[PDB]
């Protein structure tokens, strides 16, 4: 029923063709319940020039949505298209491109409408403008498409960093708990709150790189879990350095001990300073 | 109610054997349901000492609903029947008097 | 019979105590032994037919 | 009625003879001829509801 | 022998469905491991009671999918240098509590081969077990019945659902023409069935709505994700088999998810 | 102990019909059990001149428990039987003597 | 039923002499001939229409 949610956060509709503002989406992925819209504004057909006027100054980097800020053409179809690229690790990236016609955008331009017409059988966008110029112009090959993949992932990731560090460039090790708790959704288990309230010492912080890497690590969650099959069935709880080289070869993204020690310090309720499979992975499969 | 029980018992075994599954997988329940009864009857006879014939089994059940119906309604029953005894007992005696009075024949006893 | 000859109402007929649950204490623990002495029989009989 | 009763129970057995043996399969008639049995043991109870004597 | 072993035939299936490896390898292990169903082994100069650690390794040589075991290969390479001998290898083998070592590091057991040979070794083993199973279904004219090719799926999936079980039986009504299923038109499908993990991922947009892409581009996107081609008819019976809802398509809850969770 | 046997004959046939055998292989046994029972319910009548009717057939068993047991505990039932009627006779004779319409005692 | 109306106890109901044998020795050998009549009947039955 994602469509019904898409109606909630969206406030721009055209004969039922609800267009999403760039902010609504970013709010649909950051916040969970927001209702202040009270608007059917876009009916005046300013849309056809509204977006194209403002997209001409878009930041191709990690600000492609932090540059427009609630003005842009985002269709419900494209909305879901971001949801699927939300969860793609590096592995699926080439495949997600290869899932499309893979013969260059000459065969992938129509795939956009094909993306649209797919939802129809089931029953001028900002991206298409950035992907195909004005009327199907730009030849957005894989790497160019891949560029748009990672930064937009980083973007939603990055903006999340501020929402917990309250804008400051540093996130208290205590703040980093809620994000994990908001991730694992096992927050009602006070034992972890009991764990963090004493085991964690309110001290230094975590920068964006250490957090953005960790968030990216979870994008590759599965490949890590498989590399942990031999140990999970062995039930031997993992040590820090073991866990580092593990996630190293698992995701390809190194982490900082300043994170995982806390991750250990919060997830090692057994008190052995070693993460068994049911300790970390067990709660991670709550959602 | 027993007729209803006996009615659906003929439907939920009719549709379930012509439109639905089959005969050859209902028969091994068809049989097990009759033999299912035959225990209940026997179980009834062990539960209470009657061979479970309807015109009797009704009256026993009726008799429960009466006592449970009367004892709930607080209406006395012991003193009622004792009254009803005293009537017939006294009545039947008056019947014995028909011989020596209306007929002058010796009284039977 | 609802009432005796005098018209008096017959006594509340006796229902065996816990009967409906007294009977399950024998039929149920015997339905099972009714089954298990089939397993130990079919396997005891398979070696010469089916 | 006694004769008329029997004559029924001698034709109902005459119907299910031709049908079963040399017009259909017994595996076709049987699922009826259990119902007829149960049909009787339903009426033979219905009679007790109307009449109130077995 | 009607009901003699139709308990153990299901029990051993239930063991092979989900159980502890202890008795699983007690069935010696030298080559009895082929009991894991219901030409590498000629090169198995093994020792009968080999291990259960290697067993854990062994099924993963068939359990881990294509792109993922590269990481297991990388995880195996904690020494780096593109090569790791028994030191790390046999250690993580011991943490749970030989021919492969003689097949990898030579009969000398010391000469460390390039552990890149982990892939090809994984390739043939997935083939051979699939091969021997193909003969277990007695390929007539090098081909097997569509109800057999569908049967092994059920044997692969290992699910207990009477409906699709009967659908496996009812397929001769849905397919009475008869074509036979060759060993290649089934091996390509399993390689796809191996890398299911990425398919649903690649299929997530469809998953956001459903219908598992009308059975044709399904086969097309298969080759994309599976790196191997399938025919048309090979998958038509699969969609004909797993069409539990009768819609003519699949939900994730119809076919895909069951495959996904199968990797337990 | 009747209902016990009358339950295993449902147990024995529960398994033998679905689990471990067919039904078309086990139906002809239940029939030759019905028409074997309904022979006993007749042979029982030839042995003792009454029908297998639960209340009666229970009692006619109950007595054979009694006369056997009473024979063991040795007490002269014949006397008790004899001595019992006289009570229910002398008493009846008294109720006939205190007849409230037949003055004998004022 | 079980006790006389006066309160006395019913007499010892009768069991015929070894009747349980008297019934086996007449059901078994006639259970046996019921078989034998069929097999011989089966022969004549096979020499004609049905089987
Ligand atoms: Ca039958």
Swiss-Prot record, chain A:
Keywords: Disulfide bond, Membrane, Mitochondrion, Mitochondrion inner membrane, Phosphoprotein, Repeat, Transit peptide. Changing residue 70 to R: Does not affect its ability to regulate the activity of MCU. Heterodimer; disulfide-linked; heterodimerizes with MICU1. Component of the uniplex complex, composed of MCU, EMRE/SMDT1, MICU1 and MICU2 in a 4:4:1:1 stoichiometry. The keyword Mitochondrion applies. GO terms for cellular component: calcium channel complex; mitochondrial inner membrane; mitochondrial intermembrane space; mitochondrion; uniplex complex. This is Calcium uptake protein 2, mitochondrial. Its main location: mitochondrion. It is found in: Mitochondrion intermembrane space; Mitochondrion inner membrane. The modification Phosphoserine is found at residue 121. Belongs to the MICU1 family. MICU2 subfamily. The gene is MICU2. EF-hand domains 1 and 4 have high affinity for calcium and act as sensors of mitochondrial matrix calcium levels. EF-hand domains 2 and 3 are degenerate. Calcium sensor of the mitochondrial calcium uniporter (MCU) channel, which senses calcium level via its EF-hand domains. MICU1 and MICU2 form a disulfide-linked heterodimer that stimulates and inhibits MCU activity, depending on the concentration of calcium. At low calcium levels, MICU1 occludes the pore of the MCU channel, preventing mitochondrial calcium uptake. Changing residue 122 to A: Does not affect interaction with MICU2. It comes from Homo sapiens (Human). Ca(2+) 1 binds at residues 101, 103, 105, 107, 109, 112.
Curated annotation (Swiss-Prot), chain B:
The chain holds residues 238 to 346 of 351 of the full protein. It is found in: Mitochondrion inner membrane. Changing residue 51 to S: Abolished gating by EMRE/SMDT1, leading to reduced mitochondrial calcium uptake. The modification N6-acetyllysine is found at residue 95. It comes from Homo sapiens (Human). Homotetramer. Component of the uniplex complex, composed of MCU, EMRE/SMDT1, MICU1 and MICU2 (or MICU3) in a 4:4:1:1 stoichiometry. Interacts with CCDC109B/MCUB; this inhibits channel activity. Interacts with MCUR1. Interactions with MICU1 and MCUR1 are mutually exclusive. Interacts with SLC25A23. Residues 74-102 form a coiled coil. Phosphorylation by CaMK2 in heart leads to increased MCU current. The regulation of MCU by CaMK2 is however subject to discussion: another group was unable to reproduce these results. Phosphorylated on tyrosines by PTK2B/PYK2, promoting oligomerization. Undergoes proteolytic degradation by SPG7. It comes from the Eukaryota. Residues 48-109 are mitochondrial matrix. A motif (Selectivity filter) lies at residues 23-31. Changing residue 4 to W: Abolished interaction with EMRE/SMDT1 and calcium uptake. Changing residue 3 to W: Abolished calcium uptake. Changing residue 60 to A/L: Decreased interaction with EMRE/SMDT1, leading to reduced calcium channel import. Residues 19-25 are mitochondrial intermembrane. Changing residue 31 to A: Reduced mitochondrial calcium uptake. The gene is MCU. The chain crosses the membrane at residues 1-18, 26-47. This is Calcium uniporter protein, mitochondrial. Changing residue 54 to F/A/T/K: Does not affect gating by EMRE/SMDT1. Induction: MCU transcripts are down-regulated by microRNA miR-25. Down-regulation by miR-25 may protect cardiomyocytes against oxidative damage in cardiomyocytes. Residues 48-53 are annotated as: Juxtamembrane helix.
Curated annotation (Swiss-Prot), chain C:
Changing residue 11 to W: Abolished interaction with MCU. It is found in: Mitochondrion inner membrane. The GXXXX[G/A/S] motif at the C-terminal part of the transmembrane region mediates interaction with MCU and is required to activate the calcium-conducting pore in the uniporter complex. The poly-Asp region at the C-terminus mediates interaction with the polybasic region of MICU1. Belongs to the SMDT1/EMRE family. Undergoes proteolytic degradation in neurons: degraded by AFG3L2 and SPG7 before SMDT1/EMRE assembly with the uniporter complex, limiting the availability of SMDT1/EMRE for MCU assembly and promoting efficient assembly of gatekeeper subunits with MCU. Residues 7-18 are mitochondrial matrix. Essential regulatory subunit of the mitochondrial calcium uniporter complex (uniplex), a complex that mediates calcium uptake into mitochondria. Required to bridge the calcium-sensing proteins MICU1 with the calcium-conducting subunit MCU. Acts by mediating activation of MCU and retention of MICU1 to the MCU pore, in order to ensure tight regulation of the uniplex complex and appropriate responses to intracellular calcium signaling. A motif (GXXXX[G/A/S]) lies at residues 34-38. This is Essential MCU regulator, mitochondrial. The chain crosses the membrane at residues 19-38. The chain holds residues 48 to 97 of 107 of the full protein. It comes from Homo sapiens (Human).
UniProtKB/Swiss-Prot annotation, chain E:
Expressed in epithelial cell lines. Strongly expressed in epidermal keratinocytes and dermal endothelial cells. Changing residue 16 to E: Impaired interaction with MCU. Changing residue 26 to P: In MPXPS; uncertain significance. Ca(2+) 1 binds at residues 77, 79, 81, 83, 88. Changing residue 26 to A: Decreased ability to inhibit MCU channel activity in absence of calcium. GO terms for cellular component: calcium channel complex; mitochondrial crista junction; mitochondrial inner membrane; mitochondrial intermembrane space; mitochondrial membrane; mitochondrion; uniplex complex. Activated by spermine, kaempferol and SB202190, which bind MICU1 and prevent MCU pore occlusion in absence of calcium. The modification Phosphoserine is found at residue 19. One of its GO terms (molecular function) is protein heterodimerization activity. Ca(2+) 2 binds at residues 243, 245, 247, 249, 254. Residues 23-26 are annotated as: K/R-ring. Residues 64-97, 230-264 form the EF-hand domain. Phosphorylation at Ser-19 by AKT1 impairs its maturation and stability. Degraded by YME1L1 when not complexed as homodimer or heterodimer. Not degraded when complexed as homodimer or heterodimer; the presence of the interchain disulfide bond protecting MICU1 from degradation by YME1L1. Keywords: Allergen, Calcium, Calcium transport, Disease variant, Disulfide bond, Ion transport, Membrane, Metal-binding, Methylation, Mitochondrion, Mitochondrion inner membrane, Phosphoprotein, Repeat, Transit peptide, Transport. Belongs to the MICU1 family. MICU1 subfamily. This is Calcium uptake protein 1, mitochondrial. It comes from Homo sapiens (Human). The gene is MICU1.
């Amino acid at each position: 029923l994602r469509k019904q949610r898409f109606m909630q956060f969206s406030s721009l509709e055209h004969e039922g063709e609800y267009y999403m503002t760039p902010r609504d989406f970013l709010f649909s992925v950051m916040f969970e319940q927001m209702e202040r819209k009270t608007s059917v504004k876009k009916l005046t057909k300013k849309d056809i020039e509204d977006t194209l006027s403002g997209i001409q100054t878009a930041g191709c980097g990690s600000t492609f949505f932090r540059d427009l800020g609630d003005k842009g053409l985002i269709s419900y179809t494209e909305y879901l298209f971001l949801l699927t690229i939300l969860t793609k690790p590096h592995s699926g990236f080439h495949v997600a491109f290869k899932m499309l016609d893979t013969d260059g955008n000459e065969m992938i331009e129509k795939r956009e409408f094909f993306k649209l017409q797919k939802i129809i059988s089931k029953q001028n966008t900002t991206l298409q403008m950035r992907f195909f110029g004005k009327r199907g112009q730009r030849k957005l090959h894989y790497k160019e498409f891949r560029r748009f993949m990672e930064n937009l992932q980083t973007e939603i990731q990055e903006m999340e960093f501020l929402q917990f560090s309250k804008g400051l460039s540093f996130m208290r090790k205590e703040d980093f708990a809620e994000w994990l708790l908001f991730f694992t959704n096992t927050e009602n288990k006070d034992i972890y709150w009991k764990n963090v309230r004493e085991k964690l010492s309110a001290g230094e912080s975590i920068s964006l790189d250490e957090f953005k890497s960790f968030c990216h690590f979870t994008t590759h969650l599965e490949d890590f879990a498989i590399a942990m099959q031999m140990f999970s069935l062995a039930h031997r709880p993992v040590r820090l350095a073991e866990f580092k080289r593990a996630v190293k070869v698992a995701t390809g993204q190194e982490l900082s001990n300043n994170i995982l020690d806390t991750v250990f310090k919060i997830f090692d309720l057994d008190g052995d300073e070693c993460l068994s499979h049911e300790e970390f992975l067990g709660v991670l499969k709550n959602r | 109610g027993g007729l209803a029980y006996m009615a659906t018992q003929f439907g939920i075994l009719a549709r379930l054997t012509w439109w639905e599954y089959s005969w050859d997988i209902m028969e091994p329940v068809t049989y097990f349901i009759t033999y299912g009864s035959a225990m209940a009857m026997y179980a009834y006879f062990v539960m209470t000492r009657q061979e479970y014939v309807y015109p009797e089994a009704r009256d026993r059940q009726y008799l429960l609903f009466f006592h449970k119906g009367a004892k709930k309604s607080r209406f006395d029953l012991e003193k009622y029947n004792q009254l009803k005894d005293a009537i017939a007992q006294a009545e039947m005696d008056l019947k014995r008097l028909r011989d020596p009075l209306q007929v002058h024949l010796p009284l039977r006893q | 019979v609802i009432v005796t000859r005098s018209g008096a109402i017959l006594p509340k007929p006796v229902k065996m105590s816990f009967g409906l649950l007294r009977v399950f204490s024998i039929v149920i623990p015997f339905l099972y032994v009714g089954t298990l002495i089939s397993k130990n029989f079919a396997a005891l009989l398979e070696e010469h037919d089916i | 009625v006694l004769w008329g009763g029997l004559a029924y129970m001698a034709t109902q057995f005459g119907i299910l003879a031709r049908l079963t043996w040399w017009e259909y399969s017994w595996d076709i008639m049987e699922p009826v001829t259990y119902f007829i049995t149960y049909g009787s043991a339903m009426a033979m109870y219905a009679y007790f509801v109307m009449t109130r004597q077995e | 022998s009607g009901f003699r072993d139709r308990k153990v035939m299901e029990y051993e299936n239930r063991i092979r469905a989900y159980s502890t490896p202890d008795k699983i390898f007690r069935y010696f292990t030298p080559e009895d491991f082929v009991r894991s169903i219901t030409s590498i082994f000629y090169t198995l100069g093994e020792c009968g009671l080999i291990s259960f650690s290697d067993y854990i390794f062994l099924t993963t040589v068939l359990s881990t999918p294509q792109r993922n075991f590269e990481i297991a290969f990388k995880m195996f390479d904690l020494n780096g240098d593109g090569e790791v001998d028994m030191e790390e290898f046999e250690q993580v083998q011991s943490i749970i509590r030989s021919a492969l070592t003689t097949y990898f590091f030579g009969a000398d057991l010391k000469g460390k081969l390039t552990i890149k040979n982990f892939l090809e070794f994984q390739r043939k083993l997935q083939h051979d077990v699939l091969k021997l199973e193909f003969e277990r279904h007695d390929p007539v004219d090098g081909r097997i019945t569509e109800r057999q090719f569908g049967g092994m799926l059920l044997a692969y999936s290992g699910v207990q659902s009477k409906k699709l079980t009967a659908m496996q039986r009812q397929l001769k009504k849905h397919f009475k023409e008869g074509k036979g299923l060759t060993f290649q038109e089934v091996e390509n499908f399993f390689t796809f069935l191996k890398n299911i993990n990425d398919v649903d991922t690649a299929l997530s947009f469809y998953h956001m709505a459903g219908a598992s892409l009308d059975k044709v581009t399904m086969q097309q996107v298969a080759r994309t994700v599976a790196k191997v081609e399938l025919s048309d008819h090979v998958c038509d019976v699969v969609f004909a088999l797993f069409d539990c809802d009768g819609n003519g398509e699949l939900s994730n809850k119809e076919f895909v998810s069951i495959m996904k969770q199968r990797l337990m």
